[PDB]
């Protein structure tokens, strides 16, 4: 199970490292949980629609969302983090 | 450029987040530098061989190495390890 960040999602994760470590911890918990149970668990996961269909979202806080997609089958999967800051 | 962790190297990174912020900073700097110059710069990047050909290592500290691969096209920096040595 690989963890994949984009340029922008890693930048915002770094931003949290620089400004609020509590948010970093929440995001790490969301990651841990989504790798285990992609569609259930922490942060009230909900599927996005339209051009973001395959993507899912969980709450970090009311103002900040963790958007991701788990891809791959069986034993070689990946979680792609698309956003970890702001609304969708 | 996308940043890829394995289960093992993310566990390494989390371990540093839990235990030593200086290491997290040093790792973040190596990631940053390797995104702009994958085979040169901070930490004295050297290419590994044989068993681990295609991989590269940079020094985090005396006893900890940052080991990574670059794969891809139009790219990915894959962090394979960032705790311990050999």
Residue numbers in the entry:
A (entry chain A): 1 to 88
B (entry chain B): 1 to 74, 77 to 88
Lines quoted from the article behind this entry:
Type II TA systems are the best understood, and contain both a protein toxin and a more labile protein antitoxin. Many toxins have been identified that degrade RNA, including ribosome-dependent RNase toxins in the RelE family and sub-members YafQ, HigB, and YoeB. Translation inhibition arises from YoeB binding the ribosomal A site and proceeding to cleave mRNA. YoeB toxins conform to a previously characterized RNase fold consisting of two helices packed against a twisted four to five-stranded antiparallel beta sheet.
The structure of the YoeB toxin from A. tumefaciens, herein referred to as AtYoeB, was determined at 1.75 Å resolution. When compared to the EcYoeB toxin, there is an overall RMSD of 0.6 Å for the core residues with 1.2 Å deviation overall. As can be deduced from the protein sequence alignment in Figure 1, these two toxins are 57% identical (76% similar) at the amino acid level, including absolute conservation of the EcYoeB catalytic residues noted in previous studies (blue boxes). The AtYoeB sequence contains four inserted amino acids, located in a loop between beta-strands 4 and 5. This loop was disordered in one of the two copies of AtYoeB present in the crystallographic asymmetric unit; in addition, this loop makes interactions with the tungstate-terillium compound that was critical for bridging important crystal contacts and that was required to obtain usable diffraction quality crystals. The YoeB dimer interface is well conserved among this class of toxin, largely solidified by two tryptophan residues from each monomer (conserved at positions 5 and 10 for both At and EcYoeB) forming an aromatic ring cluster, in addition to polar interactions mediated by conserved Tyr13, Gln17 and Asn18 side chains. Additional interactions are noted for AtYoeB at positions that differ from its Ec counterpart: (Ec to At) Leu14Glu, Glu18Arg, and Lys32Arg. These changes generate additional polar interactions for the AtYoeB dimer. Examination of sequence variants and available structures pointed to a four amino acid helix that varies in sequence and appears to make important contacts with the first base of the mRNA codon in the ribosome.
